[PDB]
Amino acid sequence: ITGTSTVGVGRGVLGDQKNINTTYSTYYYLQDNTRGDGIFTYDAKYRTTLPGSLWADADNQFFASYDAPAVDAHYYAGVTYDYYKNVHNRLSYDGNNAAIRSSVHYSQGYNNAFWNGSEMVYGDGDGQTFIPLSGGIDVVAHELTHAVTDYTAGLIYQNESGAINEAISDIFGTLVEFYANKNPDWEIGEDVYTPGISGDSLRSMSDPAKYGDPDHYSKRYTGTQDNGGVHINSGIINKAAYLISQGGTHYGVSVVGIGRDKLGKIFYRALTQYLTPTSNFSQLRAAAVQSATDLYGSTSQEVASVKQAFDAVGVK
Ligand SMILES: [Ca+2]
Ligand SMILES: [Ca+2]
Ligand SMILES: [Ca+2]
Ligand SMILES: [Ca+2]
Ligand SMILES: [Zn+2]
Numbered sequence: 602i603t604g605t606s607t608v609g610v611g612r613g614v615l616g617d618q619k620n621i622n623t624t625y626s627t628y629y630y631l632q633d634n635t636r637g638d639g640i641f642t643y644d645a646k647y648r649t650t651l652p653g654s655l656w657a658d659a660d661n662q663f664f665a666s667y668d669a670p671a672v673d674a675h676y677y678a679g680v681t682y683d684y685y686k687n688v689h690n691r692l693s694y695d696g697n698n699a700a701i702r703s704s705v706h707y708s709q710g711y712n713n714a715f716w717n718g719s720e721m722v723y724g725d726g727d728g729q730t731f732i733p734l735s736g737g738i739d740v741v742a743h744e745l746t747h748a749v750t751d752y753t754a755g756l757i758y759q760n761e762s763g764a765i766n767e768a769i770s771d772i773f774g775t776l777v778e779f780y781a782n783k784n785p786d787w788e789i790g791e792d793v794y795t796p797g798i799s800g801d802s803l804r805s806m807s808d809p810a811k812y813g814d815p816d817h818y819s820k821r822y823t824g825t826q827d828n829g830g831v832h833i834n835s836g837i838i839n840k841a842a843y844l845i846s847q848g849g850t851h852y853g854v855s856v857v858g859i860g861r862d863k864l865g866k867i868f869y870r871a872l873t874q875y876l877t878p879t880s881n882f883s884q885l886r887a888a889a890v891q892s893a894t895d896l897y898g899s900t901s902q903e904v905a906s907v908k909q910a911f912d913a914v915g916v917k
Contacts, residue, residue: 611663
């Protein structure tokens, strides 16, 4: 919409108060004109038609419980855009400031959120397995990171390249969660998963086996479910990225950690310069080694740690 940029206030899914960028033109819309070609949030009104209606509000105050998921989808897409711009110098997901669109209230009792190739979509959850999925900043950044991958490596969604594609989304979702300093951790989706159980999450990067996902290449899933295990075998790469950052000894192999910032620089470089649509785990290892070589030198500690981490999860 064409109108005047302004700032409204609301409450997110977890009850926290936040300011959001809106546009005024008769109604106040969830349209943030301060980032790129804009961030736009739509109401899918419990249907599956997309994108639905651009979210309109009469007084620029978003404290209704129906407003919550829209507030957080809108706000956390702004934080993800800032992370990619300020840390990696990338303007939106295509690198040319493409508008970011999200729809919330998709379907009824829908336990998922996803990047469909053109925009983000978030269910409200059934209230037991999940609460509205846009309340998790790691979920929002995970999905939007699929858009970055689609415009760069283009990793196909199946078998090892799809597992890499999912791991990349977990890694960057976790880095965004650390960047916003929102009670950060190495788990995925803990803010919106099972509101009645404390301490759990959908997946763990620090110990993927806690939920039964593989943490070593010898335990990979070789069947056909989940497109060849894209959400299961991503644990092998998640564990490797956790080790590179944090260090540790895993199946007898010791890794010195180099921290999150270098982790993010190496993987972003590998993603935007060396991975291709059909890259497999062994090609990911070579891409990450080369990236760390480019940035820090072939005899750096950083290259050494990337090798040890992939050796520790059995990826040669
Ligand atoms: Ca209102
Ligand atoms: Ca957290
Ligand atoms: Ca998390
Ligand atoms: Ca829980
Ligand atoms: Zn994903």
